[PDB]
Scaffold this active site. Sequence first.
Site, PDB file in Angstrom:
ATOM      1  N   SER A  94     -19.313  -0.569  50.385  1.00 31.21           N
ATOM      2  CA  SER A  94     -19.460  -1.236  51.690  1.00 31.21           C
ATOM      3  C   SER A  94     -18.431  -0.653  52.658  1.00 31.21           C
ATOM      4  O   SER A  94     -18.313   0.581  52.748  1.00 31.21           O
ATOM      5  CB  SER A  94     -19.385  -2.740  51.466  1.00 31.21           C
ATOM      6  OG  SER A  94     -19.724  -3.445  52.647  1.00 31.21           O
ATOM      7  N   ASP A 216     -31.217  -5.273  50.231  1.00 27.43           N
ATOM      8  CA  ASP A 216     -29.850  -5.705  50.509  1.00 27.43           C
ATOM      9  C   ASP A 216     -29.894  -6.431  51.845  1.00 27.43           C
ATOM     10  O   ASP A 216     -30.146  -5.805  52.878  1.00 27.43           O
ATOM     11  CB  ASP A 216     -28.896  -4.503  50.551  1.00 27.43           C
ATOM     12  CG  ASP A 216     -27.448  -4.886  50.847  1.00 27.43           C
ATOM     13  OD1 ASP A 216     -27.167  -6.049  51.200  1.00 27.43           O
ATOM     14  OD2 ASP A 216     -26.576  -3.996  50.733  1.00 27.43           O
ATOM     15  N   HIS A 245     -26.098  -6.837  47.577  1.00 25.38           N
ATOM     16  CA  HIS A 245     -25.152  -5.989  48.279  1.00 25.38           C
ATOM     17  C   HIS A 245     -24.064  -5.419  47.374  1.00 25.38           C
ATOM     18  O   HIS A 245     -23.352  -4.497  47.792  1.00 25.38           O
ATOM     19  CB  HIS A 245     -24.512  -6.767  49.429  1.00 25.38           C
ATOM     20  CG  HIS A 245     -23.607  -5.936  50.279  1.00 25.38           C
ATOM     21  ND1 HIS A 245     -24.011  -4.748  50.848  1.00 25.38           N
ATOM     22  CD2 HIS A 245     -22.314  -6.107  50.636  1.00 25.38           C
ATOM     23  CE1 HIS A 245     -23.008  -4.230  51.533  1.00 25.38           C
ATOM     24  NE2 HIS A 245     -21.966  -5.035  51.420  1.00 25.38           N
TER      25      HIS A 245
HETATM   26 MG   LIG Z   1     -17.282  -4.709  52.825  1.00 29.25          MG
END
Ligand SMILES: [Mg+2]
Length: 267
Positions: A94, A216, A245
């Site tokens: 991420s 996601d 995610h």
């Molecule tokens: Mg993040």
Amino acid sequence: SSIGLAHNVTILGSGETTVVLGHGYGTDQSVWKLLVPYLVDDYKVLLYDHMGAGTTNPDYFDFDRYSSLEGYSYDLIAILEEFQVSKCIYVGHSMSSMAAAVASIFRPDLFHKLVMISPTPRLINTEEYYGGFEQKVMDETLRSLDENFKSLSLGTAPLLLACDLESAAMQEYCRTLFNMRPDIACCITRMICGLDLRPYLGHVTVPCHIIQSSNDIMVPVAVGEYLRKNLGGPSVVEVMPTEGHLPHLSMPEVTIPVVLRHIRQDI
Ligand SMILES: [Mg+2]
Ligand SMILES: [Mg+2]
């Protein structure tokens, strides 16, 4: 090492090439516990905690520094220099991988490639860009935030991870999520949701491996193709048969072999 202790740096394995492992929001380096044993005999492995994680000192969390993502990028650079690492293979989940992308802009000498798990440069939709969240929809969540932090922190977790409350992945995710100080997690949450890295993606030149879940809620599959078309260097996209995610945590059986392949193979 003052910077190594503040980020709980761990060094494992051996080899001419270093894999650096950076965690996403609400987790820490322990999220990589199932990937690390497959790397140590072939790479030196560097693990660090981003500032604001529950395992780091809250007092170190500078609200202005970490109101912009490159604050994390500068920490990463300082860690890599302190531990004598250059031309690393960075594996990030991420915004950790986005922080490493921007880090590679400042210091291309520190990165051989980036392996990116569920990256996004912007969550908010505009007229040309679908990030997955309408401006109005995102605004009426952030005003909730600290008034209803517990409900938002946990209530969105099953949709974010795409697994049950009884699952080990949800249990482990909440273990580290619940340790963050609320005002730190709101500040970090407000930075991620307000992030727009789109103007700078063309200045990322290091090769990028884009790893995604096919579903996601935080990263529409088209965001991966957007990254690939707008990064300034080579890139590859792999959409895994996963949901959620945090597929490296929730679905390691699919995700770990994918991550290893992109670590070992160059574009
Ligand atoms: Mg993040
Ligand atoms: Mg000391």
